[PDB]
Symmetry: D2
Subunit: 125 residues, 4 copies
Protein backbone atom coordinates (compact mmCIF):
# COMPACT_ATOMS: atom_id res chain seq x y z
CA UNK A 1 0.00 0.00 0.00
CA UNK A 2 1.15 3.61 -0.58
CA UNK A 3 2.38 5.25 2.65
CA UNK A 4 -0.42 7.89 2.54
CA UNK A 5 -2.85 5.86 0.43
CA UNK A 6 -5.16 5.82 3.46
CA UNK A 7 -4.43 9.46 4.33
CA UNK A 8 -5.18 10.82 0.86
CA UNK A 9 -8.20 8.69 -0.04
CA UNK A 10 -11.46 10.42 0.84
CA UNK A 11 -13.34 13.69 0.48
CA UNK A 12 -11.53 17.05 0.60
CA UNK A 13 -12.79 20.67 0.60
CA UNK A 14 -10.92 23.83 -0.40
CA UNK A 15 -11.23 27.48 0.63
CA UNK A 16 -13.71 28.15 -2.20
CA UNK A 17 -16.07 25.41 -1.03
CA UNK A 18 -15.18 23.02 -3.85
CA UNK A 19 -15.25 19.26 -3.20
CA UNK A 20 -12.39 16.92 -4.15
CA UNK A 21 -13.24 13.20 -3.93
CA UNK A 22 -10.22 10.98 -4.53
CA UNK A 23 -9.03 7.38 -4.26
CA UNK A 24 -5.29 6.79 -3.93
CA UNK A 25 -4.11 3.48 -5.36
CA UNK A 26 -1.21 1.43 -4.05
CA UNK A 27 0.70 2.12 -7.29
CA UNK A 28 0.55 5.94 -7.14
CA UNK A 29 -2.74 6.44 -8.99
CA UNK A 30 -5.27 9.15 -8.10
CA UNK A 31 -8.85 8.77 -9.38
CA UNK A 32 -12.00 10.64 -8.45
CA UNK A 33 -14.34 13.54 -9.08
CA UNK A 34 -14.10 17.29 -8.62
CA UNK A 35 -16.98 19.69 -8.00
CA UNK A 36 -16.10 23.38 -8.26
CA UNK A 37 -17.98 25.97 -6.24
CA UNK A 38 -16.95 28.68 -8.76
CA UNK A 39 -16.56 29.28 -12.47
CA UNK A 40 -18.13 27.65 -15.52
CA UNK A 41 -18.81 24.36 -13.79
CA UNK A 42 -21.68 22.32 -12.47
CA UNK A 43 -21.83 18.93 -10.74
CA UNK A 44 -18.94 16.46 -10.81
CA UNK A 45 -16.03 16.17 -13.25
CA UNK A 46 -13.64 13.27 -13.75
CA UNK A 47 -10.15 13.72 -12.35
CA UNK A 48 -7.01 11.63 -12.53
CA UNK A 49 -3.57 12.14 -11.05
CA UNK A 50 -0.50 10.63 -9.44
CA UNK A 51 1.12 10.76 -6.04
CA UNK A 52 4.40 9.63 -4.52
CA UNK A 53 3.48 6.26 -2.97
CA UNK A 54 6.75 6.03 -0.98
CA UNK A 55 7.49 9.50 0.40
CA UNK A 56 10.47 10.55 2.46
CA UNK A 57 10.24 9.68 6.17
CA UNK A 58 11.94 12.89 7.37
CA UNK A 59 8.70 14.82 7.92
CA UNK A 60 8.41 16.02 4.31
CA UNK A 61 5.02 16.12 2.64
CA UNK A 62 3.86 13.79 -0.13
CA UNK A 63 4.04 15.20 -3.66
CA UNK A 64 0.97 14.77 -5.85
CA UNK A 65 -0.95 16.31 -8.72
CA UNK A 66 -4.13 15.82 -10.68
CA UNK A 67 -6.07 17.16 -13.67
CA UNK A 68 -9.68 18.05 -14.39
CA UNK A 69 -10.85 18.73 -17.93
CA UNK A 70 -13.93 20.89 -17.51
CA UNK A 71 -16.24 18.81 -19.70
CA UNK A 72 -19.00 16.64 -18.32
CA UNK A 73 -22.53 15.74 -19.33
CA UNK A 74 -23.80 19.21 -18.33
CA UNK A 75 -21.22 21.71 -19.54
CA UNK A 76 -18.01 22.14 -21.49
CA UNK A 77 -15.87 25.11 -20.49
CA UNK A 78 -13.07 24.12 -22.93
CA UNK A 79 -10.41 24.30 -20.25
CA UNK A 80 -8.38 22.14 -17.93
CA UNK A 81 -6.95 22.71 -14.45
CA UNK A 82 -3.95 20.89 -13.00
CA UNK A 83 -3.26 21.05 -9.27
CA UNK A 84 0.34 20.44 -8.13
CA UNK A 85 1.10 20.20 -4.43
CA UNK A 86 1.83 18.08 -1.40
CA UNK A 87 -0.20 16.21 1.17
CA UNK A 88 0.69 17.00 4.79
CA UNK A 89 -0.58 14.44 7.28
CA UNK A 90 -1.36 14.72 10.97
CA UNK A 91 -4.10 16.05 13.21
CA UNK A 92 -4.90 18.83 10.72
CA UNK A 93 -4.27 17.04 7.42
CA UNK A 94 -3.92 19.38 4.44
CA UNK A 95 -3.29 19.19 0.70
CA UNK A 96 -1.53 22.43 -0.25
CA UNK A 97 -1.61 23.16 -3.98
CA UNK A 98 -0.94 25.65 -6.70
CA UNK A 99 -2.89 25.26 -9.92
CA UNK A 100 -2.80 26.19 -13.61
CA UNK A 101 -6.07 26.56 -15.53
CA UNK A 102 -5.58 26.66 -19.32
CA UNK A 103 -8.42 27.53 -21.69
CA UNK A 104 -8.46 26.51 -25.31
CA UNK A 105 -7.76 29.76 -27.21
CA UNK A 106 -6.97 30.99 -30.66
CA UNK A 107 -3.28 31.56 -31.17
CA UNK A 108 -3.84 35.32 -31.03
CA UNK A 109 -5.33 34.91 -27.53
CA UNK A 110 -2.82 32.31 -26.31
CA UNK A 111 -1.03 34.93 -24.20
CA UNK A 112 -4.11 35.13 -21.92
CA UNK A 113 -4.90 31.42 -21.91
CA UNK A 114 -3.66 30.43 -18.43
CA UNK A 115 -4.77 31.32 -14.89
CA UNK A 116 -2.66 30.46 -11.84
CA UNK A 117 -3.83 30.22 -8.25
CA UNK A 118 -3.50 28.28 -5.03
CA UNK A 119 -5.98 26.01 -3.22
CA UNK A 120 -5.72 24.53 0.27
CA UNK A 121 -7.75 21.39 0.94
CA UNK A 122 -8.84 20.17 4.35
CA UNK A 123 -10.80 17.15 5.52
CA UNK A 124 -13.51 19.37 7.07
CA UNK A 125 -15.73 22.28 5.98
Amino acid sequence: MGRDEAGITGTWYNQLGSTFIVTAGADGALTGTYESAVGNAESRYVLTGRYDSAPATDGSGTALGWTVAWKNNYRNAHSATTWSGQYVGGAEARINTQWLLTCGTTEANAWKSTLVGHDTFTKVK
Copy 2:
Protein backbone atom coordinates in the same frame (compact mmCIF):
# COMPACT_ATOMS: atom_id res chain seq x y z
CA MET B 1 -14.15 9.47 -30.59
CA GLY B 2 -12.64 12.68 -29.14
CA ARG B 3 -12.18 15.38 -31.81
CA ASP B 4 -8.35 15.36 -31.36
CA GLU B 5 -8.09 11.83 -29.97
CA ALA B 6 -6.16 10.92 -33.12
CA GLY B 7 -4.18 14.18 -33.10
CA ILE B 8 -3.02 13.89 -29.49
CA THR B 9 -2.29 10.15 -29.34
CA GLY B 10 1.35 9.40 -30.10
CA THR B 11 4.90 10.39 -29.20
CA TRP B 12 5.81 14.01 -28.41
CA TYR B 13 9.17 15.74 -27.73
CA ASN B 14 9.81 19.02 -25.89
CA GLN B 15 12.57 21.62 -26.12
CA LEU B 16 14.60 19.83 -23.44
CA GLY B 17 14.62 16.56 -25.37
CA SER B 18 12.11 14.84 -23.08
CA THR B 19 9.71 12.26 -24.55
CA PHE B 20 5.96 12.30 -23.90
CA ILE B 21 4.11 9.14 -25.01
CA VAL B 22 0.34 9.44 -24.65
CA THR B 23 -2.92 7.74 -25.61
CA ALA B 24 -6.04 9.90 -25.73
CA GLY B 25 -9.25 8.02 -24.98
CA ALA B 26 -12.65 8.78 -26.45
CA ASP B 27 -13.88 9.84 -22.98
CA GLY B 28 -11.20 12.48 -22.30
CA ALA B 29 -8.59 10.24 -20.67
CA LEU B 30 -4.84 10.66 -21.16
CA THR B 31 -2.56 7.72 -20.31
CA GLY B 32 1.10 7.15 -21.08
CA THR B 33 4.71 7.51 -20.03
CA TYR B 34 7.08 10.44 -19.62
CA GLU B 35 10.87 10.35 -19.95
CA SER B 36 12.66 13.51 -18.80
CA ALA B 37 15.95 14.53 -20.35
CA VAL B 38 16.79 16.59 -17.22
CA GLY B 39 16.58 16.46 -13.45
CA ASN B 40 16.39 13.58 -10.98
CA ALA B 41 14.84 11.17 -13.44
CA GLU B 42 15.71 8.09 -15.43
CA SER B 43 13.71 5.96 -17.87
CA ARG B 44 9.91 6.13 -18.09
CA TYR B 45 7.35 7.33 -15.54
CA VAL B 46 3.61 6.75 -15.48
CA LEU B 47 1.46 9.71 -16.45
CA THR B 48 -2.28 10.29 -16.46
CA GLY B 49 -4.35 13.27 -17.49
CA ARG B 50 -7.49 14.61 -19.12
CA TYR B 51 -8.31 16.53 -22.26
CA ASP B 52 -11.36 18.26 -23.70
CA SER B 53 -12.79 15.60 -26.03
CA ALA B 54 -15.20 18.05 -27.73
CA PRO B 55 -13.30 21.31 -28.25
CA ALA B 56 -14.63 24.51 -29.76
CA THR B 57 -14.72 24.55 -33.57
CA ASP B 58 -13.73 28.23 -33.89
CA GLY B 59 -10.00 27.56 -34.27
CA SER B 60 -9.29 27.43 -30.53
CA GLY B 61 -6.86 24.86 -29.17
CA THR B 62 -7.80 21.82 -27.09
CA ALA B 63 -7.29 22.17 -23.34
CA LEU B 64 -5.50 19.32 -21.57
CA GLY B 65 -3.30 18.50 -18.61
CA TRP B 66 -1.44 15.60 -17.09
CA THR B 67 0.62 14.59 -14.05
CA VAL B 68 3.82 12.65 -13.47
CA ALA B 69 4.84 11.58 -9.98
CA TRP B 70 8.59 11.14 -10.18
CA LYS B 71 8.72 7.64 -8.71
CA ASN B 72 9.43 4.56 -10.76
CA ASN B 73 11.34 1.34 -10.28
CA TYR B 74 14.69 3.17 -10.60
CA ARG B 75 14.35 6.42 -8.65
CA ASN B 76 12.10 8.42 -6.39
CA ALA B 77 12.59 12.19 -6.52
CA HIS B 78 9.65 12.82 -4.13
CA SER B 79 8.04 15.32 -6.46
CA ALA B 80 5.29 15.65 -9.02
CA THR B 81 4.92 17.78 -12.15
CA THR B 82 1.61 18.81 -13.70
CA TRP B 83 1.52 20.21 -17.23
CA SER B 84 -1.45 22.42 -18.16
CA GLY B 85 -1.85 23.59 -21.74
CA GLN B 86 -3.54 23.23 -25.09
CA TYR B 87 -3.07 21.11 -28.17
CA VAL B 88 -2.89 23.07 -31.44
CA GLY B 89 -3.45 20.95 -34.54
CA GLY B 90 -2.37 21.44 -38.12
CA ALA B 91 0.74 21.05 -40.24
CA GLU B 92 2.97 21.94 -37.28
CA ALA B 93 1.02 20.36 -34.42
CA ARG B 94 2.08 21.60 -30.97
CA ILE B 95 1.17 21.06 -27.33
CA ASN B 96 1.95 24.33 -25.54
CA THR B 97 2.18 23.97 -21.76
CA GLN B 98 3.10 25.59 -18.51
CA TRP B 99 4.00 23.30 -15.63
CA LEU B 100 4.25 23.21 -11.84
CA LEU B 101 6.75 20.86 -10.17
CA THR B 102 6.12 20.43 -6.43
CA CYS B 103 8.60 18.62 -4.17
CA GLY B 104 7.64 17.07 -0.89
CA THR B 105 9.12 19.43 1.73
CA THR B 106 9.07 20.07 5.42
CA GLU B 107 6.68 22.83 6.36
CA ALA B 108 9.62 25.16 7.01
CA ASN B 109 10.75 24.64 3.39
CA ALA B 110 7.25 24.74 1.84
CA TRP B 111 7.87 28.27 0.53
CA LYS B 112 10.47 26.86 -1.90
CA SER B 113 8.58 23.69 -2.80
CA THR B 114 7.30 24.58 -6.30
CA LEU B 115 9.02 25.26 -9.64
CA VAL B 116 7.15 26.73 -12.61
CA GLY B 117 8.16 26.57 -16.24
CA HIS B 118 6.90 26.11 -19.78
CA ASP B 119 7.37 23.25 -22.25
CA THR B 120 6.49 23.13 -25.95
CA PHE B 121 5.95 19.69 -27.46
CA THR B 122 6.23 18.85 -31.14
CA LYS B 123 5.76 15.65 -33.10
CA VAL B 124 9.38 15.76 -34.35
CA LYS B 125 12.88 16.11 -32.85
Copy 3:
Protein backbone atom coordinates in the same frame (compact mmCIF):
# COMPACT_ATOMS: atom_id res chain seq x y z
CA MET C 1 -3.15 61.45 -4.51
CA GLY C 2 -3.60 57.77 -5.46
CA ARG C 3 -6.91 56.35 -4.15
CA ASP C 4 -5.10 53.82 -1.89
CA GLU C 5 -1.83 55.76 -1.59
CA ALA C 6 -2.60 56.14 2.11
CA GLY C 7 -3.87 52.56 2.43
CA ILE C 8 -0.81 50.94 0.85
CA THR C 9 1.92 53.11 2.37
CA GLY C 10 3.32 51.57 5.55
CA THR C 11 4.70 48.36 7.01
CA TRP C 12 3.30 44.96 6.00
CA TYR C 13 3.99 41.40 7.25
CA ASN C 14 3.40 38.10 5.44
CA GLN C 15 2.69 34.56 6.65
CA LEU C 16 6.42 33.76 6.73
CA GLY C 17 7.19 36.67 9.05
CA SER C 18 8.82 38.78 6.34
CA THR C 19 8.53 42.58 6.51
CA PHE C 20 7.46 44.72 3.54
CA ILE C 21 7.98 48.48 4.02
CA VAL C 22 6.55 50.53 1.16
CA THR C 23 5.70 54.10 0.15
CA ALA C 24 3.02 54.56 -2.51
CA GLY C 25 3.45 57.70 -4.60
CA ALA C 26 0.65 59.74 -6.11
CA ASP C 27 1.82 58.71 -9.61
CA GLY C 28 1.66 54.93 -9.08
CA ALA C 29 5.19 54.40 -7.76
CA LEU C 30 6.08 51.87 -5.04
CA THR C 31 9.39 52.28 -3.20
CA GLY C 32 10.68 50.62 -0.06
CA THR C 33 12.58 47.76 1.53
CA TYR C 34 11.93 44.05 1.95
CA GLU C 35 13.26 41.82 4.74
CA SER C 36 12.74 38.09 4.20
CA ALA C 37 12.35 35.75 7.14
CA VAL C 38 13.48 32.80 4.95
CA GLY C 39 16.00 31.89 2.29
CA ASN C 40 19.39 33.32 1.37
CA ALA C 41 18.66 36.77 2.73
CA GLU C 42 19.61 39.02 5.59
CA SER C 43 18.54 42.54 6.55
CA ARG C 44 16.78 44.88 4.11
CA TYR C 45 16.73 44.86 0.31
CA VAL C 46 15.67 47.62 -2.06
CA LEU C 47 12.30 47.15 -3.74
CA THR C 48 10.46 49.10 -6.41
CA GLY C 49 7.07 48.59 -8.00
CA ARG C 50 3.91 50.11 -9.40
CA TYR C 51 0.27 50.20 -8.40
CA ASP C 52 -2.99 51.32 -9.98
CA SER C 53 -3.42 54.84 -8.55
CA ALA C 54 -7.05 55.12 -9.75
CA PRO C 55 -8.72 51.75 -9.12
CA ALA C 56 -12.26 50.76 -9.95
CA THR C 57 -14.87 51.93 -7.43
CA ASP C 58 -17.02 48.78 -7.67
CA GLY C 59 -15.38 47.02 -4.71
CA SER C 60 -12.52 45.53 -6.74
CA GLY C 61 -9.04 45.42 -5.25
CA THR C 62 -6.10 47.57 -6.38
CA ALA C 63 -3.60 45.86 -8.69
CA LEU C 64 0.08 46.22 -7.83
CA GLY C 65 3.44 44.53 -8.12
CA TRP C 66 7.02 44.97 -7.03
CA THR C 67 10.50 43.47 -7.40
CA VAL C 68 13.37 42.66 -5.07
CA ALA C 69 16.78 41.73 -6.43
CA TRP C 70 18.40 39.73 -3.66
CA LYS C 71 21.64 41.71 -3.51
CA ASN C 72 22.49 44.09 -0.71
CA ASN C 73 25.60 45.04 1.22
CA TYR C 74 25.55 41.71 3.12
CA ARG C 75 24.67 39.02 0.59
CA ASN C 76 24.03 38.32 -3.06
CA ALA C 77 21.76 35.36 -3.78
CA HIS C 78 21.81 36.04 -7.56
CA SER C 79 18.04 35.97 -7.82
CA ALA C 80 15.04 38.25 -8.02
CA THR C 81 11.45 37.90 -6.79
CA THR C 82 8.47 39.72 -8.26
CA TRP C 83 5.19 39.85 -6.34
CA SER C 84 2.00 40.42 -8.37
CA GLY C 85 -1.28 40.93 -6.56
CA GLN C 86 -3.97 43.26 -5.31
CA TYR C 87 -4.51 45.42 -2.26
CA VAL C 88 -7.86 44.89 -0.52
CA GLY C 89 -8.82 47.69 1.85
CA GLY C 90 -11.10 47.75 4.86
CA ALA C 91 -11.05 46.71 8.50
CA GLU C 92 -8.74 43.77 7.71
CA ALA C 93 -6.61 45.26 4.94
CA ARG C 94 -4.66 42.67 2.94
CA ILE C 95 -2.25 42.52 0.02
CA ASN C 96 -2.81 39.15 -1.67
CA THR C 97 0.04 38.12 -3.97
CA GLN C 98 1.56 35.39 -6.05
CA TRP C 99 5.28 35.59 -6.70
CA LEU C 100 7.97 34.35 -9.09
CA LEU C 101 11.55 33.95 -7.83
CA THR C 102 14.09 33.52 -10.67
CA CYS C 103 17.71 32.56 -9.99
CA GLY C 104 20.50 33.28 -12.39
CA THR C 105 21.35 29.87 -13.90
CA THR C 106 23.39 28.33 -16.63
CA GLU C 107 21.34 27.58 -19.70
CA ALA C 108 21.47 23.86 -18.88
CA ASN C 109 19.81 24.62 -15.52
CA ALA C 110 17.34 27.22 -16.83
CA TRP C 111 14.48 24.71 -16.59
CA LYS C 112 14.77 24.81 -12.77
CA SER C 113 15.42 28.55 -12.47
CA THR C 114 12.01 29.77 -11.23
CA LEU C 115 10.03 29.21 -8.01
CA VAL C 116 6.38 30.24 -7.70
CA GLY C 117 4.45 30.82 -4.50
CA HIS C 118 1.87 33.01 -2.81
CA ASP C 119 2.21 35.51 0.05
CA THR C 120 -0.54 37.27 2.01
CA PHE C 121 0.41 40.53 3.72
CA THR C 122 -1.41 42.06 6.66
CA LYS C 123 -0.89 45.24 8.64
CA VAL C 124 -0.37 43.26 11.89
CA LYS C 125 1.79 40.35 13.10
Copy 4:
Protein backbone atom coordinates in the same frame (compact mmCIF):
# COMPACT_ATOMS: atom_id res chain seq x y z
CA MET D 1 28.86 50.03 -12.94
CA GLY D 2 26.64 46.91 -12.87
CA ARG D 3 28.26 43.98 -14.73
CA ASP D 4 25.42 43.88 -17.34
CA GLU D 5 24.33 47.51 -16.91
CA ALA D 6 25.47 48.08 -20.50
CA GLY D 7 24.04 44.76 -21.71
CA ILE D 8 20.57 45.31 -20.27
CA THR D 9 20.12 49.01 -21.03
CA GLY D 10 18.34 49.56 -24.33
CA THR D 11 15.30 48.52 -26.34
CA TRP D 12 13.97 44.94 -26.23
CA TYR D 13 11.19 43.15 -28.17
CA ASN D 14 9.26 40.01 -27.19
CA GLN D 15 7.53 37.29 -29.20
CA LEU D 16 4.25 39.23 -29.14
CA GLY D 17 5.82 42.32 -30.69
CA SER D 18 5.79 44.32 -27.45
CA THR D 19 8.57 46.86 -26.80
CA PHE D 20 10.53 47.01 -23.53
CA ILE D 21 12.70 50.14 -23.13
CA VAL D 22 14.88 50.01 -20.02
CA THR D 23 17.81 51.75 -18.32
CA ALA D 24 19.86 49.70 -15.87
CA GLY D 25 21.46 51.76 -13.11
CA ALA D 26 24.77 51.01 -11.44
CA ASP D 27 22.92 50.28 -8.16
CA GLY D 28 20.55 47.61 -9.52
CA ALA D 29 17.70 49.88 -10.62
CA LEU D 30 15.59 49.27 -13.74
CA THR D 31 13.57 52.19 -15.15
CA GLY D 32 11.78 52.56 -18.46
CA THR D 33 8.61 52.15 -20.47
CA TYR D 34 6.64 49.18 -21.76
CA GLU D 35 4.41 49.09 -24.84
CA SER D 36 2.25 45.98 -25.18
CA ALA D 37 1.23 44.70 -28.59
CA VAL D 38 -1.76 42.88 -27.02
CA GLY D 39 -4.47 43.33 -24.42
CA ASN D 40 -6.10 46.41 -22.91
CA ALA D 41 -3.13 48.67 -23.54
CA GLU D 42 -2.08 51.53 -25.74
CA SER D 43 1.14 53.53 -25.99
CA ARG D 44 3.79 53.48 -23.25
CA TYR D 45 3.50 52.60 -19.57
CA VAL D 46 5.92 53.32 -16.75
CA LEU D 47 7.95 50.37 -15.50
CA THR D 48 10.38 49.94 -12.64
CA GLY D 49 12.40 46.96 -11.50
CA ARG D 50 15.64 45.62 -10.08
CA TYR D 51 18.48 43.47 -11.35
CA ASP D 52 21.49 41.74 -9.84
CA SER D 53 24.29 44.26 -10.49
CA ALA D 54 27.05 41.77 -9.58
CA PRO D 55 26.08 38.40 -11.08
CA ALA D 56 27.97 35.15 -10.79
CA THR D 57 30.91 34.79 -13.21
CA ASP D 58 30.36 31.06 -13.86
CA GLY D 59 28.23 31.56 -16.98
CA SER D 60 24.95 31.97 -15.09
CA GLY D 61 22.43 34.55 -16.26
CA THR D 62 21.59 37.79 -14.44
CA ALA D 63 18.41 37.73 -12.35
CA LEU D 64 16.00 40.64 -12.79
CA GLY D 65 12.36 41.62 -12.60
CA TRP D 66 10.11 44.57 -13.25
CA THR D 67 6.50 45.74 -12.92
CA VAL D 68 4.04 47.60 -15.11
CA ALA D 69 0.78 48.92 -13.71
CA TRP D 70 -1.51 49.20 -16.70
CA LYS D 71 -2.57 52.80 -16.13
CA ASN D 72 -1.37 55.67 -18.25
CA ASN D 73 -2.86 58.85 -19.65
CA TYR D 74 -4.88 56.87 -22.24
CA ARG D 75 -6.25 53.81 -20.45
CA ASN D 76 -6.57 52.08 -17.11
CA ALA D 77 -6.93 48.30 -17.25
CA HIS D 78 -6.84 47.98 -13.43
CA SER D 79 -4.11 45.36 -13.52
CA ALA D 80 -0.39 44.93 -13.08
CA THR D 81 2.13 42.56 -14.66
CA THR D 82 5.43 41.53 -13.08
CA TRP D 83 8.10 39.85 -15.20
CA SER D 84 10.66 37.68 -13.38
CA GLY D 85 13.58 36.24 -15.31
CA GLN D 86 17.23 36.38 -16.24
CA TYR D 87 19.34 38.23 -18.77
CA VAL D 88 21.61 36.00 -20.87
CA GLY D 89 24.39 37.87 -22.64
CA GLY D 90 26.38 37.05 -25.75
CA ALA D 91 25.96 37.15 -29.51
CA GLU D 92 22.22 36.43 -29.19
CA ALA D 93 21.40 38.30 -25.99
CA ARG D 94 18.06 37.32 -24.44
CA ILE D 95 15.93 38.18 -21.43
CA ASN D 96 13.94 35.05 -20.59
CA THR D 97 10.95 35.70 -18.33
CA GLN D 98 7.83 34.33 -16.78
CA TRP D 99 5.16 36.81 -15.78
CA LEU D 100 2.13 37.20 -13.50
CA LEU D 101 -0.67 39.58 -14.51
CA THR D 102 -3.08 40.35 -11.63
CA CYS D 103 -6.33 42.24 -12.19
CA GLY D 104 -8.13 44.09 -9.45
CA THR D 105 -11.16 41.90 -8.67
CA THR D 106 -13.94 41.57 -6.18
CA GLU D 107 -13.19 38.99 -3.53
CA ALA D 108 -15.69 36.61 -5.14
CA ASN D 109 -13.67 36.79 -8.39
CA ALA D 110 -10.22 36.69 -6.75
CA TRP D 111 -9.77 33.05 -7.78
CA LYS D 112 -9.58 34.16 -11.44
CA SER D 113 -7.54 37.31 -10.86
CA THR D 114 -4.10 36.18 -12.09
CA LEU D 115 -2.73 35.17 -15.51
CA VAL D 116 0.68 33.53 -15.90
CA GLY D 117 2.77 33.35 -19.05
CA HIS D 118 6.28 33.56 -20.43
CA ASP D 119 7.95 36.19 -22.63
CA THR D 120 11.32 36.03 -24.38
CA PHE D 121 12.95 39.36 -25.24
CA THR D 122 15.57 39.88 -27.91
CA LYS D 123 17.49 42.92 -29.10
CA VAL D 124 16.06 42.58 -32.64
CA LYS D 125 12.62 42.22 -34.27
